[PDB]
Amino acid sequence: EQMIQSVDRTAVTGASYFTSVDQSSVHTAEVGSHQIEPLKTSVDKPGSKKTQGEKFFLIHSARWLTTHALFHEVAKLDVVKLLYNEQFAVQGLLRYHTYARFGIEIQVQINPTPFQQGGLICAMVPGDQSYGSIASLTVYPHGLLNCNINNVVRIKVPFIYTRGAYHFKDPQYPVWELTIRVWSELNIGTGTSAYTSLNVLARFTDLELHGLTPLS
Amino acid sequence: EQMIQSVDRTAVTGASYFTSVDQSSVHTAEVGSHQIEPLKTSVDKPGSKKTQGEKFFLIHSARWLTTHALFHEVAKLDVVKLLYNEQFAVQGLLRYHTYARFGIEIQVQINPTPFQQGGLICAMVPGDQSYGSIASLTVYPHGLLNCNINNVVRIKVPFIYTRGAYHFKDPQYPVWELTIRVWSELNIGTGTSAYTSLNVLARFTDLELHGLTPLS
Amino acid sequence: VQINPTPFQQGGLICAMVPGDQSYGSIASLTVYPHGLLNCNINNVVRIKVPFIYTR
Amino acid sequence: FTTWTSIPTLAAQFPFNASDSVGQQIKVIPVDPYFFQMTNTNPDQKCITALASICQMFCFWRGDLVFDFQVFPTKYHSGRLLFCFVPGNELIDVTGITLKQATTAPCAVMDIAGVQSTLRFRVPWISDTPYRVNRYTKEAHQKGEYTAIGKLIVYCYNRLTSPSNVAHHVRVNVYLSAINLECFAPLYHAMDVTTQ
Amino acid sequence: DDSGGFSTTVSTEQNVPDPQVGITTMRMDVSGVQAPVGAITTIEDPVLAKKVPETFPELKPGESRHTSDHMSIYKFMGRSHFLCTFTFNSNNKEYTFPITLSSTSNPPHGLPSTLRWFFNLFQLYRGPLDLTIIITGATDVDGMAWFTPVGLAVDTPWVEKESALQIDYKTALGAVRFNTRRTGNIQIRLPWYSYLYAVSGALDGLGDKTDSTFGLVSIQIANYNHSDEYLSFSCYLSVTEQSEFYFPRAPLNSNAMLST
Amino acid sequence: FLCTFTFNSNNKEYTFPITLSSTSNPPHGLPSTLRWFFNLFQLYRGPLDLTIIITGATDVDGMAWFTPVGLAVDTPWVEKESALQIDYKTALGAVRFNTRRTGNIQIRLPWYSYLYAVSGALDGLGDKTDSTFGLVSIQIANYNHSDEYLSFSCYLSVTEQSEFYFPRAPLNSNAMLST
């Protein structure tokens, strides 16, 4: 008595997010393998979320002048909403996902010539620009800019939100928001440049993605 | 003699793909951390390329009839070009990348009622549908469909291409291509359904991504 | 070679030790010679050591 | 033959005015060892680079090119630039890529002031082919044969802030150097000036 | 699991080459007593398709009568087969012929009889060749034959014309110097010079005119001719041991196998 | 490539040097690959290789010889009759061959100089003396019978006993003239 083997019928086959149970199974054919190359035509690392989510995106840039008086709101920029944009690399990770958890890394770059004087402030503001004081904004994790010491600072801020995760397609309220008040007025002499440059870079830290959607 | 510490000036700071050297450095502020939740509002795993690239995409579906005579080309479908599409989840990984290396996992699903008879064939064809024989197509890694034994098969095929990697924005030639010839004609009786259903699922295996681009 | 810029000027100079000829060799390839590069930003005095280059 | 390759040789020249908008494209660099644009009137000679003479006697070239951008500012000329390498071939519409769209690609920033003035930009070997043919030897475009592994736009990342007792512009030399360089399939070809 | 998926129906990658050595040798009855399980099986299951076949009581066939294995490629294609033929007509005429592995290239302009069938049996191709040509006709002609890789410039293929290429382009790349009287024979390696990795047999579009071809040999003569006698060359290609084959393909029909 | 030359009458003596000067425009001097390569560096020391091809009329019994610097030889780049005696030619060193026997020469060029090394780009009397190192001159005989041109062409090659010194800036795209 010799038994001839047959084909399997019922099995749990499919992805963790793409699951379909078949009543008639078949062995999937596979020839070859993932052949390694001693000669690679490109010299980079392979792409991942670790190198696509953690990369600075220029979300905003301005130009601060002399005519801006004290505590004038130069820029009112939203953090995550400008990150969720088609012209950046994180759109390929945020279009196919709905609910997320992440940390925000802000880096702000300005450039004074040292014949100018003055000061700028960038603050990471959650919720609202409500009746809280402008002269009390140092309680926020912020940055202070000066025409004397340095011109590039970077800010690490966490996820500050009421619910569990953030909805991109219909948010309750924006998680973070940055503002630029004139911390000290831009004073020059004759022939000195009456302006300075301004850049706002941003990236994600510790990114989590959940809730895949088929629609756009 | 006591020395007062100062701020750093020159350092290599920035991402591996997003690199800018500053002449004036600043210590990045970071408060809080990535707080773990004993109560998660969702019960899924966090999203990754391992669960977004490895998920079956319905790239094609047809309906094979009785009037299709022997070896008639029911479907002529391209594999990777239908995978590179906006209405799928891999568009978020292939729009921000240009040169790639990957393996193709094909799964084909049809459904006969067992009062029908006939046969179908699906072959993974690289290069061309040139002067090679239709009656010699079993040399390809293929699938054979029958109205007697089974109705779902899956096919694993490697990357077959002349150069090193594949260009999405301007390809030299399509890497893979599937065809459906009528392997045996669909014969029924009176009142039996004169048709059968057909589905083509596809996903990537061992995905590599290189060459980020800013444009669309 | 000793030069002296005030740091409100900008520009650059080059001094090259050339044996033989100022022939059809490129001006934009003169960094293959043991040379010096002058700048209005970093330094103003450089010195060059070169050997005896001669046929006989 | 590694003598005339790793030593940085001047391949191009471009200034940086203060009267330009942030993100305006200054000069692209077609990333290949074949690139040079200088000449001379006394003597009448088209200025080759020492790397452009080595690789022009071959069909294929391969290596991690190291561009060295020596700016010539004062200590007080402030601002930053963007050296954004965009890979591929010698011909894509990279001029239509916006500045924030160019932040998607990997790149680097450089403050014009500081204590150094030369950035060594190690270009990765990013090509579909493991080498790249001397299509300049031929006289016809064809999809599959190319010249460069990508292009490199110098952007205006920040404005040039400076007083009036210094200059309003800072010139940037483009040195041409490399590392791990390999060429094969010898020939004879005299390269022509890339007229940008 | 590596990908976090599953598989129920047994179907995987198929058609791995080299199942068996084709020379006949002994590894008693093969079948007989035991009932044949290998006759009836499921071809839709590839594991059940890889069962040892039998239908009858059989025994050992024995050994073969030639130690030379006539079923390995490295000793089968050692016999050199036709590529092209061409004649010279006037002074300093430069002839140019490619090696175009495309099956669209009907003979003579392309692959003839044995090369068109064999080099369209498989998808990918990598390695060097051998070329054997014969000098036939008028004697005392001092010509020159050279190889030109892809990417570099060369004259127009399948056209006998005057040379527009200089000798410094010809002496730097590599050629040979020979007269028809001294040795009268060339057996040459064809160098694998490409920035691309491998070449194909049957493609479409701009990939067919680029990724199928790999090399080209072009010939200019001199001292041809004195008192009128035709000089005829003919190219026969042969194989070497450093080439390897990839992705076995369905062979061509009886229609495109055109013979010359 | 180095040069090419044809014979026209009986017992014509041809003379060609090996002039490493970049001033020497081709044909009279360095052509395409030799002019770029041997003007990449300042100093040069070592022996060469020369490969020539006999092309044209057959059964010509000629003679090819080397002459160092300092010693007398006929006028370069000039096809004329030989004014040098055979005892001067047999004592220094030559070869004897017919066009029919082997039809090929692959020869070492001997490094014969009282000076040490040679240069690529000089000026004045140093250019006409310290750049050149050697010279090969050829006289034929039995050329010719029934009129057929005999053409020679010189191709230079390299050996392993030479060494290079002082890497120099390469030449422009203008003086790299091809033949």
Numbering used by the authors:
A (entry chain B), B (entry chain B): 5 to 220
C (entry chain B): 112 to 167
D (entry chain C): 51 to 246
E (entry chain A): 3 to 29, 40 to 272
F (entry chain A): 94 to 272
The article reads:
report the characterization of 4 highly potent NAbs: F4, F6, F7, and F9. The structures of these 5 complexes are almost indistinguishable. that these NAbs prevent HAV attachment to the permissive 2BS cell surface. binds to the BC loop of VP2 and the BC loop of VP3.
analysis of these 5 NAbs is representative of the F6 mAb. (A) The F6 footprints on the HAV surface. interaction between F6 Fab and HAV capsid proteins. Interaction between F6 Fab and HAV capsid proteins. BC loop, EF loop, C terminal of a VP3, and BC loop from another VP2. involved in the interactions with F6 Fab are shown as sticks.
